[PDB]
């Protein structure tokens, strides 16, 4: 049982790190939004064009990561 | 006047369209550029109104699809009656309803799933049902498995009839727009012919 629960905890750490790191490294821009740094850390979106751009800022990556943090600590 | 008017041989029965997914849509018939295409193909499938702006064609498609739904429902009823006739303890339940649990589903013995064949009584092991088919069948006067077999066979024949009728009333003889808009006669037939009789 300890083996199984420890591998679950490892899953939590790796996924939370994925979310936060992707937020940090894509902050200045990506292929979908190559000029993101002009808009700042927190902004709502970039509109429904180009397929739709909900939750594209780095602030939103932090917002998503807090859920996984609560899951892991639980 | 209220007259039965149709068009003969509207659509040719062919396998050409089955090999061209997205044929119904002028923007989907090109083929995929992204995965989104695939999802769109399933999302716009039964939206006849967006395929064309012609009311008569929409009505004909609606009629044929309703025939298809009736065929599927008949298949479902045939399955229920056959499983009641072949894999149930209905006959034993007829002699002790308060102490025996109804059951009409049994499982094969692999990977240990046969434990699901529980002790329901009457020398029978299986899964207990809650749909209430046993009470309905008892209220209809059914006392034998042969009668259930006959009902299942009849339902299979009716399902075949509904599917063929869908094919005929779409690809062979399709009613005109004036036929569908006779609401007075439709109300008369469905109030008196269907419900009353």
């Amino acid at each position: 049982g300890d083996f199984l629960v420890h591998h679950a905890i490892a899953l939590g750490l790796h996924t939370t790190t994925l979310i936060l790191v992707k937020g940090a490294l894509d902050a200045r821009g990506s292929k979908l939004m190559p000029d993101k740094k002009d808009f700042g850390y927190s902004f709502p979106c970039d509109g429904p064009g180009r397929g739709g751009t909900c939750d594209i800022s780095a602030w939103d990556a932090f917002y998503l990561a807090v859920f996984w943090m609560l899951n892991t600590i639980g | 006047e209220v007259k039965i008017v149709v068009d003969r041989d509207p659509v040719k029965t062919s396998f050409e369209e089955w090999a061209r997914p997205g044929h119904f849509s002028r923007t989907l018939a090109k083929g995929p550029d992204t995965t989104t295409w695939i999802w769109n193909l399933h999302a716009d499938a039964h939206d006849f109104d967006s395929h064309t702006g012609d009311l008569e064609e929409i009505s004909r498609k609606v009629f044929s699809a309703h025939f298809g739904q009736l065929s599927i429902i008949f298949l479902w009823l045939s399955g229920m009656y056959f499983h009641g006739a072949r894999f149930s303890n209905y006959e034993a339940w007829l002699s002790d309803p308060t102490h025996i649990g109804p059951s009409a589903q049994v499982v094969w013995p692999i990977v240990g799933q046969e434990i699901l064949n529980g002790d329901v009584g009457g020398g029978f092991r299986g899964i207990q049902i809650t749909s209430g088919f046993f009470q309905l069948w008892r209220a209809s006067g059914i006392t034998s498995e042969l009668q259930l077999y006959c009902t299942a066979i009849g339902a299979l024949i009716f399902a075949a009839l509904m599917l063929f009728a869908g094919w005929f009333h779409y690809h062979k003889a399709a009613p005109k727009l004036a036929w569908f808009q006779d609401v007075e006669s439709m109300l008369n037939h469905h109030l008196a012919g269907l419900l009353g009789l």
Binding site: - | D49, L55, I58, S59, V62, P97, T98, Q128, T130, S131, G132, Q135, L136, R138, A139, Q181, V183
Partner: protein, 69 residues
């Protein structure tokens, strides 16, 4: 009402959905089949099932009325 399939669908869905809730309420209190009332699992199942079906149909009525508008 003679030129729009969506409006007809909206009205009919609303009526059928409400009727199903009526059926669920009436079948528990006046059990029509023999040996049904004392089969508690069947009674609970039938009531719950028809409640869910009626709710879904009523929601569909609003959807297709919006499509009409």
């Amino acid at each position: 009402l003679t030129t729009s399939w969506h409006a007809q669908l909206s009205l009919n869905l609303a009526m059928l959905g409400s009727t199903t809730i009526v059926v669920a309420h009436h079948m528990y209190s006046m059990p029509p089949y023999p040996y049904l009332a004392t089969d508690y699992g069947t009674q609970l199942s039938l009531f719950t099932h028809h409640m869910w079906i009626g709710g879904f149909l009523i929601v569909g009525a609003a959807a297709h009325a919006a499509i009409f508008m």
